[PDB]
Amino acid sequence: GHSYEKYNNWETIEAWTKQVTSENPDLISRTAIGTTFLGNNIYLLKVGKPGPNKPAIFMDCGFHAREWISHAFCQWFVREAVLTYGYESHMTEFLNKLDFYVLPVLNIDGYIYTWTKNRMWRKTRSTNAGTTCIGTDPNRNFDAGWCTTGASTDPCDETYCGSAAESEKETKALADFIRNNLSSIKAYLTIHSYSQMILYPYSYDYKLPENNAELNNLAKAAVKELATLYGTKYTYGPGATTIYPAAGGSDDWAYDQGIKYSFTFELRDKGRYGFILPESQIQATCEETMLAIKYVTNYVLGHL
Numbered sequence: 140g141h142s143y144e145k146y147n148n149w150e151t152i153e154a155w156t157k158q159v160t161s162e163n164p165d166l167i168s169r170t171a172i173g174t175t176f177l178g179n180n181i182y183l184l185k186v187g188k189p190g191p192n193k194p195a196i197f198m199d200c201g202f203h204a205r206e207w208i209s210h211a212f213c214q215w216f217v218r219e220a221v222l223t224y225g226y227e228s229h230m231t232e233f234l235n236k237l238d239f240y241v242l243p244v245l246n247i248d249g250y251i252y253t254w255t256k257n258r259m260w261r262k263t264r265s266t267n268a269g270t271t272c273i274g275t276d277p278n279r280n281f282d283a284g285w286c287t288t289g290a291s292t293d294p295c296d297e298t299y300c301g302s303a304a305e306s307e308k309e310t311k312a313l314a315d316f317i318r319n320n321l322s323s324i325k326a327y328l329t330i331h332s333y334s335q336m337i338l339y340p341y342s343y344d345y346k347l348p349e350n351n352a353e354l355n356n357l358a359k360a361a362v363k364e365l366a367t368l369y370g371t372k373y374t375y376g377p378g379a380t381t382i383y384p385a386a387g388g389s390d391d392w393a394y395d396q397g398i399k400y401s402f403t404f405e406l407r408d409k410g411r412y413g414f415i416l417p418e419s420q421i422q423a424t425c426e427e428t429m430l431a432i433k434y435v436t437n438y439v440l441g442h443l
């Protein structure tokens with residue numbers, strides 16, 4: 140069964156998307172935006188009070204299979220939204236005024252693989268011509284300085300950029316959806332672990348985004364907000380210099396589509412447990428992360 144303080148396998152997460160939608164008909168709608176290489180449905184949840192011409196924030200989790208706390212966060216977020224709507228003033232305002240598109244798990248095939256075969260799997264599970272090596276790094280697969288730096292052209296490597304940009308059904312589906320909704324999507328938030336950072340563009344080059352001063356101030360405010368709960372310290376900055384240069388990432392691509400608020404979140408911890416973050420830390424991790432996501436949401440709402 141589904142728990143919010145445990146990591147849930149895909150069958151359970153899928154059942155949950157159907158259940159939470161059924162239980163909250165005027166706050167949540169479910170669609171699928173594509174299928175994975177292995178035929179799983181890429182569900183997207185539209186969270187918000189329906190209305191005409193509403194702006195939106197897009198958030199995805201589970202780009203990378205082994206980053207389990209990411210998947211956990213998208214599920215936590217959805218419950219918080221439906222539990223507190225009508226009671227907590229900010230979330231009530233958020234859901235009245237905008238829609239959150241929440242994509243609980245992008246890389247479903249890899250996630251399943253981390254449950255069944257290899258806890259440390261990262262990439263998708265697509266096949267590659269001329270080799271037995273499996274998978275492409277979805278966050279090297281977007282059309283953003285594609286495969287020029289911090290990526291591999293070898294399918295056997297963890298950062299394989301794929302045979303071409305959007306070669307993966309999963310990344311094509313995500314790009315297609317975002318391209319189809321550019322008029323409404325005002326921010327892009329992509330949830331990863333670990334490192335306790337908020338990154339903004341660019342990672343594929345050392346050039347800075349036009350609005351980098353604003354993004355820096357926004358990230359700064361968001362991390363200090365996060366720290367209020369448990370003292371957790373996040374660093375922040377443009378990807379290339381803050382963590383490492385790397386091309387083909389979705390945050391850079393979304394920004395260059397015109398989504399001016401584009402962030403990669405790296406959640407707990409800083410390496411003690413790394414990707415294998417204890418379930419005992421899910422609640423506290425999600426709780427503090429909510430504060431940063433809500434700060435960003437309120438700021439974006441104030442700049443429409």
Ligand SMILES: CC(C)[C@H](NC(=O)OCc1ccccc1)P(=O)(O)O[C@H](C(=O)O)c1cccc(NC(=N)N)c1
Pocket residue numbers: 203206278279289297298331332333334338342343378382384385386387388389390391403405
């Ligand atoms: C621990 C955490 C930072 C993860 N990093 C990771 O597994 O690094 C492994 C690795 C191994 C060899 C070469 C490069 C990278 P990840 O979540 O995969 O980091 C993102 C990524 O590399 O896709 C990441 C972190 C910060 C910013 C961005 N943005 C971007 N467009 N590159 C992307």
Ligand SMILES: [Zn+2]
Pocket residue numbers: 202203206331332
């Ligand atoms: Zn990641």
